[PDB]
Design an enzyme around this catalytic site. Structure first.
Site, mmCIF file in Angstrom:
data_model
loop_
_atom_site.group_PDB
_atom_site.id
_atom_site.type_symbol
_atom_site.label_atom_id
_atom_site.label_comp_id
_atom_site.label_asym_id
_atom_site.label_seq_id
_atom_site.Cartn_x
_atom_site.Cartn_y
_atom_site.Cartn_z
ATOM 1 N N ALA A 1 0.876 -1.169 0.000
ATOM 2 C CA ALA A 1 0.000 0.000 0.000
ATOM 3 C C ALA A 1 0.919 1.226 0.000
ATOM 4 C CB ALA A 1 -0.946 -0.015 1.182
ATOM 5 N N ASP B 1 -3.092 -7.645 -4.422
ATOM 6 C CA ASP B 1 -3.445 -6.238 -4.448
ATOM 7 C C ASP B 1 -4.129 -5.824 -3.150
ATOM 8 O OD1 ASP B 1 -2.701 -6.105 -7.150
ATOM 9 O OD2 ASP B 1 -4.604 -5.271 -7.803
ATOM 10 N N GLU C 1 0.430 -7.158 -14.902
ATOM 11 C CA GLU C 1 -0.545 -8.189 -15.303
ATOM 12 C C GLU C 1 -0.266 -8.762 -16.674
ATOM 13 O OE1 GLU C 1 -4.985 -7.521 -15.978
ATOM 14 O OE2 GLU C 1 -4.786 -8.287 -13.915
ATOM 15 N N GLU D 1 -10.864 4.285 -7.311
ATOM 16 C CA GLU D 1 -10.870 5.665 -6.807
ATOM 17 C C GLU D 1 -9.630 6.402 -7.286
ATOM 18 O OE1 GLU D 1 -11.476 4.053 -2.613
ATOM 19 O OE2 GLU D 1 -12.746 5.873 -2.619
ATOM 20 N N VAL E 1 -6.474 8.073 -5.359
ATOM 21 C CA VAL E 1 -5.299 7.305 -4.912
ATOM 22 C C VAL E 1 -4.132 7.289 -5.877
ATOM 23 C CG1 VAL E 1 -6.729 5.824 -3.500
ATOM 24 C CG2 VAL E 1 -6.168 5.113 -5.837
HETATM 25 O O1 LIG Z 1 -0.192 4.164 -6.161
HETATM 26 C C1 LIG Z 1 -0.043 2.922 -6.113
HETATM 27 C C2 LIG Z 1 -0.600 2.024 -7.106
HETATM 28 C C3 LIG Z 1 -0.594 0.676 -6.869
HETATM 29 N N1 LIG Z 1 -0.395 0.211 -5.552
HETATM 30 C C4 LIG Z 1 -0.368 -1.269 -5.248
HETATM 31 O O2 LIG Z 1 -0.424 -1.971 -6.505
HETATM 32 C C5 LIG Z 1 -1.676 -2.730 -6.611
HETATM 33 C C6 LIG Z 1 -2.072 -2.721 -8.116
HETATM 34 O O3 LIG Z 1 -2.612 -1.444 -8.468
HETATM 35 P P1 LIG Z 1 -4.169 -1.195 -8.580
HETATM 36 O O4 LIG Z 1 -4.862 -1.995 -7.550
HETATM 37 O O5 LIG Z 1 -4.391 0.284 -8.514
HETATM 38 O O6 LIG Z 1 -4.454 -1.739 -10.062
HETATM 39 P P2 LIG Z 1 -5.935 -2.050 -10.594
HETATM 40 O O7 LIG Z 1 -6.388 -3.409 -9.912
HETATM 41 O O8 LIG Z 1 -6.868 -0.981 -10.115
HETATM 42 O O9 LIG Z 1 -5.765 -2.253 -12.065
HETATM 43 C C7 LIG Z 1 -2.598 -1.917 -5.656
HETATM 44 O O10 LIG Z 1 -3.674 -2.741 -5.174
HETATM 45 C C8 LIG Z 1 -1.640 -1.693 -4.482
HETATM 46 O O11 LIG Z 1 -1.408 -2.888 -3.749
HETATM 47 C C9 LIG Z 1 -0.158 1.061 -4.487
HETATM 48 O O12 LIG Z 1 -0.076 0.671 -3.323
HETATM 49 N N2 LIG Z 1 -0.162 2.414 -4.777
HETATM 50 O O1 LIG Z 2 -7.152 -5.584 -18.467
HETATM 51 C C1 LIG Z 2 -7.086 -6.112 -17.160
HETATM 52 C C2 LIG Z 2 -7.635 -5.085 -16.218
HETATM 53 O O2 LIG Z 2 -9.085 -5.095 -16.312
HETATM 54 C C3 LIG Z 2 -9.792 -4.163 -15.467
HETATM 55 O O3 LIG Z 2 -11.163 -4.478 -15.425
HETATM 56 C C4 LIG Z 2 -12.042 -3.939 -16.429
HETATM 57 C C5 LIG Z 2 -12.406 -5.030 -17.449
HETATM 58 O O4 LIG Z 2 -11.211 -5.543 -18.027
HETATM 59 C C6 LIG Z 2 -13.294 -4.435 -18.548
HETATM 60 O O5 LIG Z 2 -13.795 -5.479 -19.386
HETATM 61 C C7 LIG Z 2 -14.519 -3.724 -17.939
HETATM 62 O O6 LIG Z 2 -15.221 -3.059 -18.935
HETATM 63 O O7 LIG Z 2 -14.143 -2.761 -16.912
HETATM 64 C C8 LIG Z 2 -13.374 -3.396 -15.815
HETATM 65 C C9 LIG Z 2 -13.179 -2.287 -14.784
HETATM 66 O O8 LIG Z 2 -14.387 -1.542 -14.636
HETATM 67 C C10 LIG Z 2 -9.294 -4.219 -14.015
HETATM 68 O O9 LIG Z 2 -9.765 -3.120 -13.236
HETATM 69 C C11 LIG Z 2 -7.762 -4.174 -13.962
HETATM 70 O O10 LIG Z 2 -7.380 -4.098 -12.621
HETATM 71 C C12 LIG Z 2 -7.201 -5.392 -14.727
HETATM 72 O O11 LIG Z 2 -7.793 -6.646 -14.344
HETATM 73 MN MN LIG Z 3 -6.168 -3.811 -7.832
#
Ligand SMILES: O=c1ccn([C@@H]2O[C@H](COP(=O)(O)OP(=O)(O)O)[C@@H](O)[C@H]2O)c(=O)[nH]1
Ligand SMILES: OC[C@H]1O[C@@H](O[C@H]2[C@H](O)[C@@H](O)[C@H](O)O[C@@H]2CO)[C@H](O)[C@@H](O)[C@H]1O
Ligand SMILES: [Mn+2]
Length: 287
Positions: A54, A144, A236, A279, A283
């Site tokens: 975090a 995450d 990813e 958010e 963040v």
């Molecule tokens: O400013 C940063 C962005 C990412 N993360 C860490 O990296 C993970 C992956 O980023 P995020 O969850 O924002 O990716 P998303 O799932 O929204 O694509 C987050 O859950 C946190 O554990 C963090 O701590 N701060």
């Molecule tokens: O690309 C991987 C990425 O996907 C985001 O999720 C998206 C989803 O892929 C898309 O089909 C849909 O329309 O919106 C979702 C979010 O609202 C994830 O948020 C990201 O963390 C990865 O998993």
């Molecule tokens: Mn995440």
């Protein structure tokens, strides 16, 4: 000497994918016998680790909820160690932990870009596995922070290498997966290839395997930087390339990492973890 049919019955969930072509189980609610495994793992006296990062306002927004829910639902019945990586330890919420939970906290450097905060986890996790996690736990999950445990996330999820089916694409065909499609990237996966789209929000395995996952991913992340390209879905994309090359020995259904924005369709029988609403305006501090 655990045997797959000792704990896994795919026939309990006939309507979803429960076995991969390489014989790995896809763990769905109904298919696992947790009592059998709890008994098995407890005789081995395992410990399970969980890393979570975090950095920035992710701390205030998500870390307490994450940890409170992990305390309650992760590997209940077995020793767990939570490894918390934060850039500012003074903002660490110091919740009360339950029986068989303990933790430790590390201060890490905040990378400037959120994309690099997310990717650099791969480097940091491997450093920690080598320095201490390999000596402390039998299995490690890396997760995450922006999500919350909702029900038991137990020993049915353990294995040498464990991948998470991403909630939006689990029923999709490979050519719709959002793999990195630029051949210039280390994470490239050509159309026509691919087994699943895995979510980078949860992966795990033994320390040895997770070290290889993270090392390989970080190698691709660095390689891309030298080629002036950044994978479309950051770590990813790399993780999916990893698991294409090195198939996971276990996959978790989207029940283990569910986005309630989708709703709750029939296949999702018992949610063990849910995404937090995004958010980013608060963040993240760059585009
Ligand atoms: O400013 C940063 C962005 C990412 N993360 C860490 O990296 C993970 C992956 O980023 P995020 O969850 O924002 O990716 P998303 O799932 O929204 O694509 C987050 O859950 C946190 O554990 C963090 O701590 N701060
Ligand atoms: O690309 C991987 C990425 O996907 C985001 O999720 C998206 C989803 O892929 C898309 O089909 C849909 O329309 O919106 C979702 C979010 O609202 C994830 O948020 C990201 O963390 C990865 O998993
Ligand atoms: Mn995440």
């Amino acid at each position: 000497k655990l045997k797959l049919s000792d704990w896994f019955n795919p026939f309990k969930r006939p309507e979803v994918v429960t076995m991969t072509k390489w014989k790995a189980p896809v763990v769905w609610e109904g298919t696992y016998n947790r009592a059998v495994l709890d008994n098995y793992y407890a005789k081995q006296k395992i410990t399970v680790g969980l890393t979570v990062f975090a950095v920035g306002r992710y701390i205030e927004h998500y870390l307490e909820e994450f940890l409170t829910s992990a305390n309650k639902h992760f590997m209940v019945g077995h020793p767990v160690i939570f490894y918390i990586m934060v850039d500012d330890v003074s903002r660490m919420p110091l919740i009360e932990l339950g029986p068989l939970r303990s933790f430790k906290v590390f201060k890490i450097k905040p990378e400037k870009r959120w994309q690099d905060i997310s990717m650099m986890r791969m480097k940091t996790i491997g450093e920690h596995i080598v320095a201490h996690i390999q000596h402390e736990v039998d299995f490690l999950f890396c997760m995450d922070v922006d999500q919350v445990f909702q029900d038991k996330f137990g020993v049915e999820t353990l294995g040498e290498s464990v991948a998470q089916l991403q909630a939006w694409w689990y029923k999709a065909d490979p050519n719709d997966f959002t793999y990195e499609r630029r051949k210039e990237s280390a994470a490239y996966i050509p159309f026509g290839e691919g087994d699943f789209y895995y979510h980078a929000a949860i992966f795990g395995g033994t320390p040895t395997q997770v070290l290889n996952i993270t090392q390989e991913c970080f190698k691709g992340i660095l390689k891309d930087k030298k080629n002036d390209i950044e994978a479309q879905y950051h770590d990813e994309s790399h993780l999916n390339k990893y698991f294409l090359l090195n198939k996971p020995t276990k996959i978790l259904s989207p029940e283990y990492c569910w986005d309630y924005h989708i709703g709750l369709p029939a296949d999702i029988k018992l949610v063990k973890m849910s995404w937090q609403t995004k958010e980013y305006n608060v963040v993240r501090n760059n585009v």
